[PDB]
Design a protein around this ligand. Structure first.
Ligand SMILES: NC(=[NH2+])NCCC[C@H](N)C(=O)O
Ligand SMILES: NC(=[NH2+])NCCC[C@H](N)C(=O)O
Ligand SMILES: NC(=[NH2+])NCCC[C@H](N)C(=O)O
Ligand SMILES: NC(=[NH2+])NCCC[C@H](N)C(=O)O
Ligand SMILES: NC(=[NH2+])NCCC[C@H](N)C(=O)O
Ligand SMILES: NC(=[NH2+])NCCC[C@H](N)C(=O)O
Lengths: 78, 78, 77, 78, 76, 79
């Protein structure tokens, strides 16, 4: 689950950033749903859920984890 | 649109959760847009807006209502 | 960017906000097109956008608020 | 499977039409993915695949079945 | 906003194959243009499906995709 | 590097290929359709008129006289 997700970060994670309770993941064009699917399937305790657009994913942090901490988590796994 | 929304929450709402000012609603795969449409049309006074992904809807709470209080309202129709 | 400004005039139905989020409404189907221009404008106080069908969430960079982003969009339009 | 999809048709199938090897299904706003997921999961031998837009689904007929025949089949299930 | 104004603003290219007109738009515009086409209620259009930058417009028999594509092209 | 990136992603993302008439129908894992279709689009194959992606399906529209079956066989064999 997490392993499959971490593999995909390599190719699919262009950058991370955050604001408040949100991690904002940028992907290549069109890749948001594919990387978001892998994140959802990993069912991280830190993650309430995700919404994918086209090249951006909003990852909603489960309190008290912050978006900045989630962003650092994804960066470390890349 | 409140009654139609309630019917659709009954049919399509798999789970609710929250973080900060956000209620996170899960649906079966592909049903997020149809349910989010029903929510938008209800024009709830404590809802700023919604975005639907594929199986997840972010519903933005209007202060002073929190994501948790919003999710609780939805959950009570699930 | 004024590609963004042109599309705000064309597509921005209304603005609203909550916490660190500006909520932009567009005609049905037009959210991705507006959001693209916003992304391309690369505003310092915008962390990113997610477009649905008729709604865009614009994530404000701390300590900018969603209300402030909303007013900026009204200003550029 | 087909049962499940068939019970959606009263609510989700606004109209059917065809051209060549294609059936064009119209749905309410946002329901295209919701109905198309159900069609995909029915795994009909006369359907090669589907693409959902927002209020339209393109259902691709498996030869020798024509779009018009597929359209009739959905109408007959409704 | 009307198809007849948006075709010029939103079309990158028109092309065709068989019963399909294939329209390309800038990134993210497919649904916005396709909405306009849907609302134009053209007798020779069975329906549209939009992805992100591409729309398939289904020609009503016996109209061909080339005939539809020509119409979209000429109104740009 | 357009065609090579496409060839890589076909192997990684194709679940199955099929066809009907002037269409190749490509199936991907859930959510991967746009990312695969992007690569196809960027490869700009002279026999592909365009593509449309849903969530887990892609239609690739063949340029006449190339058929859906010919494109599908080309895609299948790049896996
Ligand atoms: N080709 C596009 N749709 N571009 C716009 C993307 C808008 C927004 N960043 C999202 O991912 O939802
Ligand atoms: N089949 C898929 N698209 N799965 C991924 C969904 C990603 C995210 N939960 C969303 O709803 O937007
Ligand atoms: N035609 C529709 N898809 N309507 C529902 C829109 C739901 C939500 N406001 C969004 O923009 O994502
Ligand atoms: N609200 C909208 N997205 N409207 C445009 C729909 C375009 C096309 N009929 C489709 O379903 O793909
Ligand atoms: N940014 C993207 N989603 N790019 C891929 C577009 C794929 C296909 N041409 C469509 O419009 O459905
Ligand atoms: N999770 C989903 N959206 N499933 C439905 C997919 C519908 C259709 N096969 C498409 O790709 O457009």
């Amino acid at each position: 689950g997490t392993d499959r997700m971490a593999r995909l970060l390599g190719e699919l994670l262009v950058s991370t950033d955050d604001s408040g309770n949100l991690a904002v993941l940028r992907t290549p064009p069109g890749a948001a749903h594919y990387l978001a699917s892998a994140i959802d399937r990993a069912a991280l305790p830190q993650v309430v859920g995700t919404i994918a657009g086209d090249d951006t994913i909003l990852v909603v942090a489960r309190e008290p984890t912050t978006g900045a901490q989630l962003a650092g988590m994804f960066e470390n796994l890349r």
